[PDB]
Amino acid sequence: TGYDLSASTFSPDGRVFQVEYAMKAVENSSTAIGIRCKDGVVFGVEKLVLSKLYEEGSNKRLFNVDRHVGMAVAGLLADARSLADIAREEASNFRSNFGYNIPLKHLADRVAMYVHAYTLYSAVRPFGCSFMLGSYSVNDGAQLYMIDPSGVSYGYWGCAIGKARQAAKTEIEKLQMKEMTCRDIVKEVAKIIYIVHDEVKDKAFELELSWVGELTNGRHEIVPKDIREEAEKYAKESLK
Amino acid sequence: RFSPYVFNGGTILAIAGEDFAIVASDTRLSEGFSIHTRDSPKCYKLTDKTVIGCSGFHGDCLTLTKIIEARLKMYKHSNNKAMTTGAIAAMLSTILYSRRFFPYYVYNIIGGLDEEGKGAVYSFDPVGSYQRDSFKAGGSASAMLQPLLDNQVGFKNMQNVEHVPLSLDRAMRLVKDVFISAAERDVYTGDALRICIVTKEGIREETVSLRKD
Amino acid sequence: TTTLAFKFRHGVIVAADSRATAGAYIASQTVKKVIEINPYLLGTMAGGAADCSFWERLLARQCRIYELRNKERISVAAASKLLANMVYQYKGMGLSMGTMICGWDKRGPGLYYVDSEGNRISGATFSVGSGSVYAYGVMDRGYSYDLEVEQAYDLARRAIYQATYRDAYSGGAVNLYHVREDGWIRVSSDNVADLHEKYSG
Amino acid sequence: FNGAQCKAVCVEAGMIALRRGATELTHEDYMEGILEVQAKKKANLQY
Amino acid sequence: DRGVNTFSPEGRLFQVEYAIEAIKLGSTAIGIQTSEGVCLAVEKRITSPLMEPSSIEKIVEIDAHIGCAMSGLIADAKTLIDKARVETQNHWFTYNETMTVESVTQAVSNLALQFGEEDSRPFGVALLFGGVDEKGPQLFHMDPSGTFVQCDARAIGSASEGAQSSLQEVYHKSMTLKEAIKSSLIILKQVMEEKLNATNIELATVQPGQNFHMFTKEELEEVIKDI
Amino acid sequence: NQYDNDVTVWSPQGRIHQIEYAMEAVKQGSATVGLKSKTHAVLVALKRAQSELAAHQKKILHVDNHIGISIAGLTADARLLCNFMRQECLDSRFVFDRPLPVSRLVSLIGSKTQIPTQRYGRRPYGVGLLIAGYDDMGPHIFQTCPSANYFDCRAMSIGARSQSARTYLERHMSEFMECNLNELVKHGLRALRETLPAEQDLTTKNVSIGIVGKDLEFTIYDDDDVSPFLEGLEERPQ
Amino acid sequence: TQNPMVTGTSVLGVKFEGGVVIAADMLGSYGSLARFRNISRIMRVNNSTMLGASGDYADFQYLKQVLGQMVIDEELLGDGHSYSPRAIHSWLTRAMYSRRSKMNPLWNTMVIGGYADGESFLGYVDMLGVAYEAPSLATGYGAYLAQPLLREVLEKQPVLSQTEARDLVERCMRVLYYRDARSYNRFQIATVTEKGVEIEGPLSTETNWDIAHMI
């Protein structure tokens, strides 16, 4: 209301309204949470079918950036695809220049600088994405990071991105997060996603769960969720 | 030092008939005093009425074959119809001059049918000339094969010998005899023979062996 | 390889052989050397096949562009000049090209001579090739300006016959082209041995 | 389809049965109202 | 809407719709495909007696069998004609053959709507293309937006509505040549304003057996006096 | 509404309306329908004309030996992405000497159309791609959007009044999976005959069908191998 | 590379029924000095194809890096699609040709062995881009020495078993140990099947010298 056009200009009270408007763009996006255990990091995304036109296995927001790192994006999908390609490129340069796996702090700092560089100038807009970054290493343990649309990148035990950002972490934080291995945390994330928004505004949603840790020996892939089928036989027991 | 060329050898034949174009070639690929294989056909089937053969340096032959296939698809996917034979000849001449100052060390023979439904053989040189002739022999066994084709196809240097048009099965017996006779004296010729026949009804192929040395 | 050309009262005579060897080995006997640029221009092939073919085809492209932009047919000197300007830009890089340019003009007859060394000159008689000196000799014997048509045909044909009889790098079919006021016209395609039987006595 | 459209649909169907001069409303005319312009246009369609 | 790099809330071309509007002010032209051959006509709209009639170009010569007609803005047509001449010669260079008229007009509409000032403006001309490919005669019509289509008898520019209507009245598929010629100049002297004479209009007819000289020069007088 | 002019500007509700306007520009194309069986993928479009005498503007165009696209919207961007598509096909056909899987090609399409949707100085591409192909795992029917958010389906339909087509696809998507080519194609035109107003009927010259098969090369058909496809029908239930 | 610093030596490969065996030794000689007598000259590519090379060892490290990154990239595409061995062969051929076109060749002699989709594959890539398919490959001096044994047995028996192939490879490596000056009595056998890719350990040879007791 006065000056919020360019991404270079300041306000009479000193903040950039472009960055705020891009931050609350992801607020309308789907709910995506993440949490780590003592030997791994678990992702989970509330994903919704439009009406009946999807195929249940298209456009998966669970990407796979490096051999041990993947994203859990939410927001504008194509911008997240481009950012995932940039992250693949950065891990490519590191693997080509130093001969070992990228530490997640350095990767997150390069990605944060790339996002900040798209927030700086006036020709371009800030990104409309907010994503998660998990990892595991034998000499480092489990690491879960978090990048906002502005470019502030730091670490968590658990997080949530979407509508129910507070309404997930209200009952995320009552989890005994340290003493659990991630194979419990699979159905834990299942119940957390299943709590929020069963039928209220939309009609139907669908669950994806990504999975990295010591049990994959350092690999990162989606769970065989059909194996052990841990949502629904507990989701039907989570309504009471 | 590093030499950019090497002589792989090979022998390609072509005969332009009344309504057919026969292209045949041995499948020996060698280098110096060794044998790399006994199966490498120099012939390539572009369209239903065009067969190209490429001898000389083999890697340039492979590269040139793939580039020709790409431009064939570009003409087809641009203009809703396949190329003629002379159009393919013109295009290859433009390519061979487009790498004038670092030449392909490749002899080229394009056989095929014209738009009248008659045979047409367009020869080449490494630098990019072409012409519509009735018969060519390219490669190492060129000089072992051209004068005999002058004797039989052209009916040259003969007296009171009338000119009969060259039929198909006569051409088949000619090609088999000239490859046996040239494989006896050549070192870059033998172990097989891949005979390609282009008619008005498709492409036929035929595999005839030779001596195994 | 031996070509010649000379203009006179009734247009221009152009003749050539059709042999194109490869070192000591003859490739073909029927190499059409006189490259038909236009329905009013004739270019030749004088040293190198590919170079002459490419640059004359590009010159034909340029001439067709020139006519379609001006609605008026190009002159001969302009075409020879364009060829010399295009050839000069690769001097020292190893181009062999010694072609001739013939055609009809608003001025009438036109005869130019373009080298890969760029020696664009006018004239009345020219002859290029290894055995060109033989053609120069017998042609500058039989040359005049007031010649007839069949006289010029026999002169050029005898000249090319002498050239292929003496030189080793020449032979094949004897082409014979005739440039008129309206357009060029192919005269005949005569073999060497037929001329040997006819002119040996 | 908001009220107005549906109200415009039923009035269209009424006036459609009025076209022939009917005494009743046929689901044909109801479908005609449904499939009327629906306040949608046009198109040109122009290239 | 101000600017070639902004859409509409609905479906407006703007930087192109205003060009399609800018076509309409030009002089008219009528080309008609017939299997005997393609005929074509135009109006010059001569203003002055000093205005020398043979200098105004409407029908130019692209190939020995490919004609043209222009519309509206003069110099965008000059640009497209120059490039079209250059590219057919390139086709003859690399293929020893004639670039067919569909391939000609695709080659024109590769950049007939490719206007970019950064990374210039859209062109302001409608073109009528006639030629004789291997499939016989062809009549072709493009636009500034590159939306190129075949047309059997297309009319452009000013008064093209009644031109199309009265053209669809008389035309069918098995017409002849001269009947279509006089049917065209009837439509012309219903849509022009001045008296039809030797200097107003010009014809351009291409036949498969008469590929050369796609023009009629003052036998057109004899054609006009037969009405 | 004074923020609603360029691609760069985020809205105060976060919805960049240039993307919405490009969507609405896609909504004014011709109707087209693509749907696959387990072994054959068929996409069928609808032709239109400028006048009666003129020919019809074509929609199904060829790309590669196993790739063919439908289209809706602009045609300059259509041919631009066509040339880029053919280029990337012959690029990998040159280098890897294999046919392309479809998913990486459409990812390259999204990455291609990403740049004109984020920087200043290019417009989003008004485009209506319906892509049919064959990787090792059978037919694929993808669709695009000007927002580059490409979708995979089993049967989609885009263009003008394409929603009744979608209802037909809803009530026969279970039935689609089993059948061979012929009744599959006639399900496609039993979507197209509801993409039309009821007072006129689909003729020969206005419809186009392109089949790609697991052993069958991609081939377009027009009126003559479509006269076999147009019989085997009844009238609409009037 | 104009002058090869550290060269390998001959690589042997031959198809059999549903698999390809490749074996090369472990020597890094510089000139005549056997400077690096414990090195690995076979890369086990992801699950189907497999690479072994000769010539400059540094260039092999380079191509190991590039090929590893490309395979990692396609495996991170997550599409379920991999490289066929013939695709690897095509890419490597184009790479060497575009390398040598710039007059800076990679001094190598590479062997690609793969088994995918029922069919085996064994491709050859030269420095000059000369590339073909063969039922048995032999590089360096192996094309002069162990090639006629391969071509004898393939003429004597067109198909093979894995055991016959492995025994024949052992005999050929023994022969190469007998009369190649750039050879060494330590080699590793690598084998692909449908069961995966397997690299055996540093085997050795059993030699004979009973002609030395003669004059």
PDB file of C-alpha atoms in Angstrom, chain B residues 13-92:
ATOM      1  CA  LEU B  13      30.377 -51.976 -56.036  1.00  0.00           C
ATOM      2  CA  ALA B  14      27.415 -50.455 -57.820  1.00  0.00           C
ATOM      3  CA  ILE B  15      25.535 -51.316 -61.002  1.00  0.00           C
ATOM      4  CA  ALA B  16      22.821 -49.106 -62.463  1.00  0.00           C
ATOM      5  CA  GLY B  17      20.229 -51.214 -64.263  1.00  0.00           C
ATOM      6  CA  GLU B  18      17.149 -50.419 -66.278  1.00  0.00           C
ATOM      7  CA  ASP B  19      14.950 -50.453 -63.177  1.00  0.00           C
ATOM      8  CA  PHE B  20      17.303 -51.578 -60.421  1.00  0.00           C
ATOM      9  CA  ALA B  21      20.381 -50.470 -58.513  1.00  0.00           C
ATOM     10  CA  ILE B  22      22.550 -53.204 -57.011  1.00  0.00           C
ATOM     11  CA  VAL B  23      25.049 -52.231 -54.312  1.00  0.00           C
ATOM     12  CA  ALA B  24      27.280 -54.905 -52.794  1.00  0.00           C
ATOM     13  CA  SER B  25      30.224 -54.805 -50.415  1.00  0.00           C
ATOM     14  CA  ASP B  26      32.494 -57.113 -48.448  1.00  0.00           C
ATOM     15  CA  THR B  27      32.334 -57.127 -44.643  1.00  0.00           C
ATOM     16  CA  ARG B  28      36.022 -57.304 -43.743  1.00  0.00           C
ATOM     17  CA  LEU B  29      37.344 -54.561 -41.465  1.00  0.00           C
ATOM     18  CA  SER B  30      41.098 -54.705 -40.963  1.00  0.00           C
ATOM     19  CA  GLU B  31      44.016 -52.523 -39.891  1.00  0.00           C
ATOM     20  CA  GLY B  32      47.645 -53.008 -40.911  1.00  0.00           C
ATOM     21  CA  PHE B  33      48.432 -56.690 -40.467  1.00  0.00           C
ATOM     22  CA  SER B  34      45.462 -57.716 -38.369  1.00  0.00           C
ATOM     23  CA  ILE B  35      41.761 -58.472 -38.749  1.00  0.00           C
ATOM     24  CA  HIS B  36      39.293 -56.684 -36.540  1.00  0.00           C
ATOM     25  CA  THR B  37      36.161 -58.460 -37.764  1.00  0.00           C
ATOM     26  CA  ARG B  38      34.535 -60.441 -40.546  1.00  0.00           C
ATOM     27  CA  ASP B  39      31.132 -58.760 -40.270  1.00  0.00           C
ATOM     28  CA  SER B  40      30.805 -55.036 -40.984  1.00  0.00           C
ATOM     29  CA  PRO B  41      28.466 -54.261 -43.903  1.00  0.00           C
ATOM     30  CA  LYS B  42      29.389 -51.109 -45.786  1.00  0.00           C
ATOM     31  CA  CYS B  43      25.865 -50.834 -47.196  1.00  0.00           C
ATOM     32  CA  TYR B  44      23.099 -48.807 -45.544  1.00  0.00           C
ATOM     33  CA  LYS B  45      19.398 -48.684 -46.438  1.00  0.00           C
ATOM     34  CA  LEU B  46      18.161 -45.104 -46.276  1.00  0.00           C
ATOM     35  CA  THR B  47      14.721 -45.210 -47.918  1.00  0.00           C
ATOM     36  CA  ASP B  48      12.788 -47.760 -49.937  1.00  0.00           C
ATOM     37  CA  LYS B  49      14.683 -46.617 -53.047  1.00  0.00           C
ATOM     38  CA  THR B  50      18.088 -45.494 -51.768  1.00  0.00           C
ATOM     39  CA  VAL B  51      21.075 -47.477 -50.500  1.00  0.00           C
ATOM     40  CA  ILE B  52      24.361 -45.795 -49.564  1.00  0.00           C
ATOM     41  CA  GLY B  53      27.754 -47.426 -49.109  1.00  0.00           C
ATOM     42  CA  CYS B  54      30.686 -45.909 -47.246  1.00  0.00           C
ATOM     43  CA  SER B  55      34.277 -47.186 -47.236  1.00  0.00           C
ATOM     44  CA  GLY B  56      37.571 -45.730 -46.126  1.00  0.00           C
ATOM     45  CA  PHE B  57      38.075 -44.547 -42.565  1.00  0.00           C
ATOM     46  CA  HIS B  58      35.347 -46.280 -40.602  1.00  0.00           C
ATOM     47  CA  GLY B  59      34.638 -43.749 -37.843  1.00  0.00           C
ATOM     48  CA  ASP B  60      34.053 -41.018 -40.396  1.00  0.00           C
ATOM     49  CA  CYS B  61      31.775 -43.479 -42.210  1.00  0.00           C
ATOM     50  CA  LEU B  62      29.713 -44.002 -39.052  1.00  0.00           C
ATOM     51  CA  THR B  63      29.527 -40.274 -38.317  1.00  0.00           C
ATOM     52  CA  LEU B  64      28.564 -39.462 -41.901  1.00  0.00           C
ATOM     53  CA  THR B  65      25.923 -42.213 -41.923  1.00  0.00           C
ATOM     54  CA  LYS B  66      24.277 -40.866 -38.781  1.00  0.00           C
ATOM     55  CA  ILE B  67      24.338 -37.243 -40.011  1.00  0.00           C
ATOM     56  CA  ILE B  68      22.743 -38.323 -43.306  1.00  0.00           C
ATOM     57  CA  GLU B  69      20.053 -40.191 -41.347  1.00  0.00           C
ATOM     58  CA  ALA B  70      19.381 -37.063 -39.293  1.00  0.00           C
ATOM     59  CA  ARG B  71      18.979 -34.856 -42.346  1.00  0.00           C
ATOM     60  CA  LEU B  72      16.759 -37.483 -43.993  1.00  0.00           C
ATOM     61  CA  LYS B  73      14.498 -37.230 -40.970  1.00  0.00           C
ATOM     62  CA  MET B  74      14.668 -33.434 -41.146  1.00  0.00           C
ATOM     63  CA  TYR B  75      13.524 -33.346 -44.776  1.00  0.00           C
ATOM     64  CA  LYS B  76      10.776 -35.890 -44.097  1.00  0.00           C
ATOM     65  CA  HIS B  77       9.573 -34.176 -40.914  1.00  0.00           C
ATOM     66  CA  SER B  78       9.639 -30.808 -42.680  1.00  0.00           C
ATOM     67  CA  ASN B  79       8.218 -31.484 -46.129  1.00  0.00           C
ATOM     68  CA  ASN B  80       5.882 -34.526 -45.763  1.00  0.00           C
ATOM     69  CA  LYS B  81       7.754 -36.630 -48.354  1.00  0.00           C
ATOM     70  CA  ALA B  82      10.974 -38.570 -48.739  1.00  0.00           C
ATOM     71  CA  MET B  83      13.970 -37.309 -50.697  1.00  0.00           C
ATOM     72  CA  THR B  84      14.847 -38.284 -54.252  1.00  0.00           C
ATOM     73  CA  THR B  85      18.179 -39.857 -55.138  1.00  0.00           C
ATOM     74  CA  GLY B  86      19.753 -36.748 -56.663  1.00  0.00           C
ATOM     75  CA  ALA B  87      18.630 -34.689 -53.678  1.00  0.00           C
ATOM     76  CA  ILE B  88      20.532 -37.062 -51.386  1.00  0.00           C
ATOM     77  CA  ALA B  89      23.537 -36.781 -53.717  1.00  0.00           C
ATOM     78  CA  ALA B  90      23.367 -32.980 -53.643  1.00  0.00           C
ATOM     79  CA  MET B  91      23.039 -32.979 -49.867  1.00  0.00           C
ATOM     80  CA  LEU B  92      26.063 -35.240 -49.458  1.00  0.00           C
TER      81      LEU B  92
END
